């Protein structure tokens, strides 16, 4: 049920190369748009991924990039997903032509928060949430991509990691919460690199001294309060995604 026949795939355009390999646009059975992730040989714990792919295919949410299936009876193996016409969110934010209103930026945050609240309810961690791992469809909807995929990569996201990850490798729902706050910052900074004047090593040292990302000028005071709550020193004092969604909806109503 998780296996797609590669003979049903028509490769049409190269979209670019990502963290796991080249990505191409194509058609399934000459009809349906798909993205084809070609996993470069030797780069992935493939046996482990196949078994988790069966779990990932039961995760269905409108704001999760849908896994259609995999091709593993050959090499290199393929991951077949929903095609997102406007590409990755990081590049989308950096296209200044869009001249985003802040209501649009907030809607991007809400889209991701809904997907993350869904994964939280399923006790599934993303483990590498960032704007590079979010995608935008033709209607401008943002969806979360490649959730959990870093577990099978055989360059660590320091700038999206809370102190207990940098210090102790302590992963939890709350390290996803922290990363979400950084993602809100990426969105409202129109895709700047977090801690844009620091190296990873300096970021870690400054994070330990209590430094935090400044308020992007496009975020209102209430929006900065939301992203800032994701960065509490003590992980247990960080909200859940259900709480963040209620907070995002509250601000959306106030700034409508
Ligand atoms: C931020 C990361 C990044 O830039 N890349 C390189 C490119 C491939 C990208 O993946 C997809 N890219 C597009 C796309 C790219 N350009 N246009 C017009 C659409 C669509 N879909 N639909 C499912 C997946 C992808 C991820 C990695």
């Amino acid at each position: 049920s998780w296996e797609i026949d590669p003979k049903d795939l028509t490769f049409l355009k190269e979209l670019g190369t990502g963290q796991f390999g080249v990505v191409k646009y194509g058609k399934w059975r000459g009809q349906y748009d798909v993205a084809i992730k070609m996993i470069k040989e030797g780069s992935m714990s493939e046996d482990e991924f196949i078994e988790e792919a069966k779990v990932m295919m039961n995760l269905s949410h409108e704001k999760l990039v849908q896994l259609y299936g995999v091709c593993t009876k050959q090499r290199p193996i393929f991951i077949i997903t929903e095609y997102m016409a406007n590409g990755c969110l990081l590049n989308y934010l950096r296209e200044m032509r869009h001249r985003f209103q802040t209501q649009q930026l907030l809607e991007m945050c809400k889209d991701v928060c809904e997907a993350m609240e869904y994964l939280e309810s399923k006790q599934f961690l993303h483990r590498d949430l960032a704007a590079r791992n979010c995608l935008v469809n033709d209607q401008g909807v943002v969806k979360v991509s490649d959730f959990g995929l870093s577990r099978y990569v055989l360059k660590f996201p320091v700038r999206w990691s809370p102190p207990e990850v940098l210090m102790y490798s302590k992963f939890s729902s709350k390290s996803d919460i922290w990363a979400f706050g950084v993602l809100m910052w990426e969105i409202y900074s129109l895709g700047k690199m977090p801690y844009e004047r620091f190296t990873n090593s300096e970021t870690a040292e400054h994070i330990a001294q209590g430094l935090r990302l400044y308020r992007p000028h496009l975020a209102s005071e209430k929006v900065y309060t939301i992203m800032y709550s994701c960065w509490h020193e003590k992980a247990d004092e960080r909200p859940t995604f259900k709480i963040l969604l209620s907070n995002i909806l509250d601000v959306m109503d106030e700034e409508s």
Side-chain angles (χ1 to χ4, degrees), residues 15-18 23 35 65 81-91 131-135:
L15 307 172
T17 48
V23 183
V65 172
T81 79
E82 178 171 7
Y83 175 69
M84 305 289 285
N86 272 320
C88 72
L89 176 62
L90 184 53
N91 292 335
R132 61 175 171 278
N133 291 321
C134 295
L135 295 159

Side-chain angles (χ1 to χ4, degrees), residues 203-204 206-215:
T203 295
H206 277 95
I207 277 301
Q209 297 170 357
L211 173 149
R212 294 298 184 263
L213 293 161
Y214 59 83
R215 174 171 162 206

